[PDB]
């Protein structure tokens, strides 16, 4: 301190920081709106402060490629630290430098296309659970809270694809549904991040210290009972890198569970909102599914990859609602990328949400228009502008699994039901002014049987 002269010095523009707070008062309308304003106010690069922490936004595709791919192992390797984490320091999304590179290696083969084709029959069976829990609400002409029913399915696939456990968590108190339920503080970190090590010597975990105590033992119950799913594929790996330890493995289990719980369910809710508020896209998708799977035939790994309009709908939804909002890398050395000095310790940020809604790359960016991703037009889309799964060595490892999971859900559900707005549906949907990509009011819709 005071780091607050850095961008003034480097000749990089940006909003003037308040003492201690930096620019965080500007987060009151949410990360997203702040980024969009800076992008129009300042242009291709700018700089702000989360407390004393300098953040350099970049929006040049080449420069973004340099950061995320070209200079990844050398400079922009780790994400911005947050804490206290405790033993979750060993989770892949959290770990750093060579220990991350190791965890990335030991867990990469789990996420292969071939391993994912063997999860399809299991992910298929809960697609049926999802339809019956839907019909019980459709036959009773009462509006439906999509996050609950998508959450219950997304919860079902996680427990199954990651440990073998098999519940219809919507309807009992099966010993597993509840510890995963615990699925203001985090803003006080930003002004006082010098207090993270304080909390790390106090063993306060941002992960409720009890959930983790439940699964550290629950895994070693499963580990010593067996002795097709993620835990097996990880136990099988630990049989050039030091093999995955037992606590290390639990920490990955925790990452996968959250990674694909609120994500899968949130995205599915954004897609169903768009398909209800655009009934022709919905009909057109329903037709393509009936063309590929006539007589409500069950989707397989290969018929899913055949559905091009389904892919367009998923991609365009993620353009509008990229649930990460930003990508970030901590610059670990004095570097120069594409003619611009970047001093060590700066956090480099890619404003994905702003870049997805930039009129300078998107005609009518607020409109939901799947055709942007027609095989005709899909080629003009800059892949360092549309980045819903990141890019380079540290992108979303669960990308293909998440696309596959969501699409199986949609096919099964669109085969059987159409989706209409209720009077209680929020149109236009508004994003949580807070810190997550979720709707302000939950998405509720009328569900009717075909
Ligand atoms: C629609 C669903 C999802 C979306 C849009 C999404 C998006 C992202 C993004 C943007 C990142 C940061 C990438 C970067 O920094 O370049 C990321 C990281 C990550 N994601 Fe996902 N994600 C989704 C679901 C999942 C799922 C289901 C898993 C399940 C295993 C998963 C596992 C991970 C991991 C482990 C990382 C950190 C990877 C690393 O640092 O090595 N994600 N995701
Ligand atoms: C800075 C602030 C306090 C505002 O929020 C964060 O601290 N958020 C990141 C920090 S790691 C996060 C750890 C985690 C585990 C369980 C519950 C919550 C969080 C993680 O592994 N999530 C996986 C994931 C989630 C979503 C998609 N794909 C994968 C989460 C993250 C974002 C983007 C890429 C990678 C991680």
Swiss-Prot record:
One Pfam short name: p450
GO MF, one annotated term: steroid binding
Consequence recorded when altering residue 92 to V: In allele CYP3A4*4; significant decrease in catalytic efficiency
Annotated compartments: Endoplasmic reticulum membrane; Microsome membrane
Effect of residue 399 to T: In allele CYP3A4*3
Record membrane topology: Single-pass membrane protein
UniProt-reported outcome of changing residue 148 to H: In allele CYP3A4*10
Enzyme Commission number, as recorded: 1.14.14.1, 1.14.14.56, 1.14.14.73, 1.14.14.55
Effect listed in the UniProt record for changing residue 327 to F: In allele CYP3A4*12; has an altered testosterone hydroxylase activity
EC main group: oxidoreductase
Disorder named in the UniProt entry: Vitamin D-dependent rickets 3: An autosomal dominant disorder of vitamin D metabolism resulting in early-onset rickets, reduced serum levels of the vitamin D metabolites 25-hydroxyvitamin D and 1,25-dihydroxyvitamin D, and deficient responsiveness to parent and activated forms of vitamin D.
Its job: A cytochrome P450 monooxygenase involved in the metabolism of sterols, steroid hormones, retinoids and fatty acids. Mechanistically, uses molecular oxygen inserting one oxygen atom into a substrate, and reducing the second into a water molecule, with two electrons provided by NADPH via cytochrome P450 reductase (NADPH--hemoprotein reductase). Catalyzes the hydroxylation of carbon-hydrogen bonds.
Similarity section: Belongs to the cytochrome P450 family.
Name under which the protein is recorded: Cytochrome P450 3A4
Source organism per UniProt: Homo sapiens
């Amino acid at each position: 301190t005071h780091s607050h002269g850095l961008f003034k010095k480097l000749g990089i523009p940006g909003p003037t920081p308040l003492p201690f707070l930096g620019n965080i008062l500007s987060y009151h309308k949410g990360f997203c709106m702040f980024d969009m304003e800076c992008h129009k106010k300042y242009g291709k690069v700018w700089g702000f402060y989360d407390g004393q922490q300098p953040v350099l936004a970049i929006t040049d595709p080449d420069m973004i490629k340099t950061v995320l791919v070209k200079e990844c192992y050398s400079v922009f390797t780790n994400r911005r630290p947050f804490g206290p984490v405790g033993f979750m320091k060993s989770a892949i999304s959290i770990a750093e430098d060579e220990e991350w590179k190791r965890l990335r290696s030991l867990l990469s083969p789990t996420f292969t296309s071939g391993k994912l084709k063997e999860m399809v029959p299991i992910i298929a069976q809960y697609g049926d659970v999802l339809v019956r829990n839907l019909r019980r609400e459709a036959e009773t002409g009462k509006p439906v809270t999509l996050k609950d029913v998508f959450g219950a399915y997304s919860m079902d696939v996680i427990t199954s694809t990651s440990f073998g456990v098999n519940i219809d968590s919507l309807n009992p108190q099966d010993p597993f549904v509840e510890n995963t339920k615990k699925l203001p503080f985090f803003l006080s970190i930003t002004v006082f991040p010098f207090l993270i090590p304080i909390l790390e010597v106090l063993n306060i975990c941002v992960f409720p210290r009890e959930v983790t105590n439940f699964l550290r033992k629950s895994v070693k119950r499963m580990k010593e009972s067996r002795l097709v799913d993620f835990l097996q594929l990880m136990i099988d790996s630990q049989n050039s890198h030091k093999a995955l330890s037992d606590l290390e493995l639990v920490a990955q289990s925790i990452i996968f569970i959250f990674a694909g719980y609120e994500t899968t369910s949130s995205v599915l809710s954004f897609i169903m909102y768009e398909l209800a508020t655009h009934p022709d896209v919905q009909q057109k998708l329903q037709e393509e599914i009936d063309a590929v799977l006539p007589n409500k035939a069950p989707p397989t790994y290969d018929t899913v990859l055949q559905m091009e309009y389904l892919d367009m709908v998923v991609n365009e939804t993620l353009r509008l609602f990229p649930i990460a909002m930003r990508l970030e890398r901590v610059c670990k050395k004095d570097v120069e990328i594409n003619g611009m000095f970047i001093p060590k310790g700066v956090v480099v940020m890619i404003p994905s949400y702003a870049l997805h809604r930039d009129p300078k790359y998107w005609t009518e960016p607020e409109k939901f228009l799947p055709e942007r991703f027609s095989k005709k037009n899909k080629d003009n889309i800059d892949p360092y502008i549309y980045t819903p799964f990141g890019s380079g060595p540290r992108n979303c490892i669960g990308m293909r699994f998440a696309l596959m999971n969501m699409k199986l859900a949609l096919i099964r559900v669109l085969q059987n039901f159409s989706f209409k707005p209720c009077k209680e549906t929020q149109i236009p949907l508004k994003l949580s002014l807070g810190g997550l990509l979720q709707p302000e009011k939950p998405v509720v819709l009328k569900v009717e049987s075909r």
